[PDB]
């Protein structure tokens, strides 16, 4: 018998871009790990 500690499914509640996900913010994606977005192919 041991004390209960959080597991992966518990921890994943805090992994979204936002707490309390709604229908609109469901398609929000969490930012990159470093704060660097992939460059856009906006060819000049």
């Amino acid at each position: 018998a041991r004390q209960w500690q959080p597991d992966v499914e518990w921890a994943e509640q805090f992994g979204g871009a936002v707490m309390y996900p709604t229908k609109e913010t469901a398609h929000w994606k969490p930012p990159p790990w470093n704060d660097v977005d992939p460059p856009k192919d906006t060819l000049v």
């Binding site: 018998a1 004390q3 209960w4 518990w10």
Partner: protein, 459 residues
């Protein structure tokens, strides 16, 4: 008051500089020594309180509460060291540190001369309790319990802070002596009604008043054993002590502002006692019993008579001892079978006879058998309530019956019948557990011989 306080603080580095295998021994020895020294506050002058200094003072209301706190610390250490054996040295020292900080905050709160200091310490008790519950709690549900315990308490106590600073602006002081000697009647106005509510609701939620009691089953059930012990024995009594102090500036408004709280407390007495009859969890049952007892204390404080104040003091002390004993008794079985369900282990008297004796005595003091101090307090409150109105006897009478019912129900379900066939890991009782039960019980029985000590200031 410094003589009691400094050694308690000393306990802190004594445990931080102790060898890894001597922390429990050292803490227990010196906690007991501190309890002995405190025992000397019971000498009371009579006409007035003992004022050690501008900052601290002791009362006949206060002296019993302090002795109970200091005595509860070593018992919590005895109860903790079993389930904390696998823990690292640093975390064990942190747990003991939490308990010591809690004792320190409690001693100061009871003896502070003025309300702002009382408020600060009365609120500081929240941090160690929350840390104990949420860090050492066995179940996942402890996090939710911690939030309930925190938020219910702060939602009551912040209006109290506003009311206190307003009162010091209008009166010039919050010192309790000046507050008492310069007391003036509270008019009947909306401003005074809301001042009354802001002065009362924090202590109401601490008791807890019925309907604002939902935090208590959560917090008392999800806490480790020492957390539960201190939550039931002492922390509930902060509300009663604070209410007894604060109701001096509230007259004559209390005459009719008390009606809804009296109705809630009497009917909810009946309600929580009935709830105890259909409970599948054994800690849940002890928690609701505490609620029922504190409802009686709320009635006693609201009706504002000398007999009711005496009964309230006696009942607070007796409840503190009995409830801690019942929690420890439940925890022994939980340690055996790793479940809180009451019908899991049955017929334990066949396997553990002396523990069954402890169970019987705890159940007998819970139902207030004469001449225990539980019945002294309950009888004094019931008489004062009868004087207040003769119809209270019906509610009081009903409560006495339901309490006997669920107390003996718990005893019969856990100790009698036949043992569950499958469970075969019920080892003999340890000396530690038996000594813990005796150290709960002997003091209660001893108190019957000298009833006046726990009676209070009115006596």
């Amino acid at each position: 008051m410094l003589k009691i306080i400094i050694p308690t603080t000393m306990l802190l580095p004594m445990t931080w500089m102790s060898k890894h295998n001597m922390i429990w021994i050292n803490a227990t020895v010196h906690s007991l020594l501190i309890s002995l020294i405190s025992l000397s506050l019971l000498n009371q002058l009579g006409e007035n309180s003992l004022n050690f200094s501008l900052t601290f003072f002791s009362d006949s209301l206060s002296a019993p509460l302090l002795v109970l706190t200091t005595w509860l610390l070593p018992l919590m250490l005895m109860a903790s060291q079993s389930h904390l054996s696998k823990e690292t040295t640093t975390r064990k020292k942190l747990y003991i540190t939490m308990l010591i900080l809690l004792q320190l905050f409690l001693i100061m709160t009871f003896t502070a001369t003025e309300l702002i200091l009382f408020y600060i310490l009365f609120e500081a008790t929240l941090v160690p309790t929350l840390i104990i519950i949420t860090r050492w709690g066995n179940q996942t549900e402890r996090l939710n319990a911690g939030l309930y315990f925190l938020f219910y308490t702060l939602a009551g106590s912040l209006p109290l802070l506003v009311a206190l600073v307003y009162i010091q602006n209008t009166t010039g002081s919050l010192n309790f002596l000046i507050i008492h000697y310069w007391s003036h009647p509270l008019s009947n106005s909306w401003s005074n009604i809301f001042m009354w509510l802001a002065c009362i609701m924090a202590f109401m939620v601490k008791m807890p008043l019925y309907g604002l009691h939902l935090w208590l089953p959560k917090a008392h059930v999800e806490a480790p054993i020492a957390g539960s012990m201190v939550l039931a024995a002492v922390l509930l009594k902060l509300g009663g002590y604070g209410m007894m102090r604060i109701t001096t500036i509230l007259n004559p408004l209390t005459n009719y502002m008390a009606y809804p709280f009296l109705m809630l407390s009497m009917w909810g007495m009946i309600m929580t006692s009935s709830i105890c009859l259909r409970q599948t969890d054994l800690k849940s049952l002890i928690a609701y019993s505490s609620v029922s007892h504190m409802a009686l204390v709320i009635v006693a404080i609201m009706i504002q008579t000398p007999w009711s104040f005496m009964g309230a003091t006696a009942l607070m002390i007796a409840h503190g001892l009995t409830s801690s004993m019942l929690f420890c008794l439940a925890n022994t079985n939980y340690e055996r079978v790793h479940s809180r369900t009451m019908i899991l282990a049955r017929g334990l008297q066949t396997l553990l006879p002396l523990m069954a004796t402890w169970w019987l005595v705890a159940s007998l003091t819970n139902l207030a058998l004469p001449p225990s101090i539980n019945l002294i307090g309950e009888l004094f409150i019931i008489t004062a309530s009868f004087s207040w109105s003769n119809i209270t006897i019906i509610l009081m009478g009903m409560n006495m019956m339901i309490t006997a019912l669920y107390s003996l129900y718990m005893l019969i379900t856990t100790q009698r019948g036949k043992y569950t066939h499958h469970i075969n890991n019920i080892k003999p009782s340890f000396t530690r557990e038996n000594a813990l039960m005796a150290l709960h019980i002997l003091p209660l029985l001893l108190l019957t011989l000298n009833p006046k000590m726990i009676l209070g200031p009115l006596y």
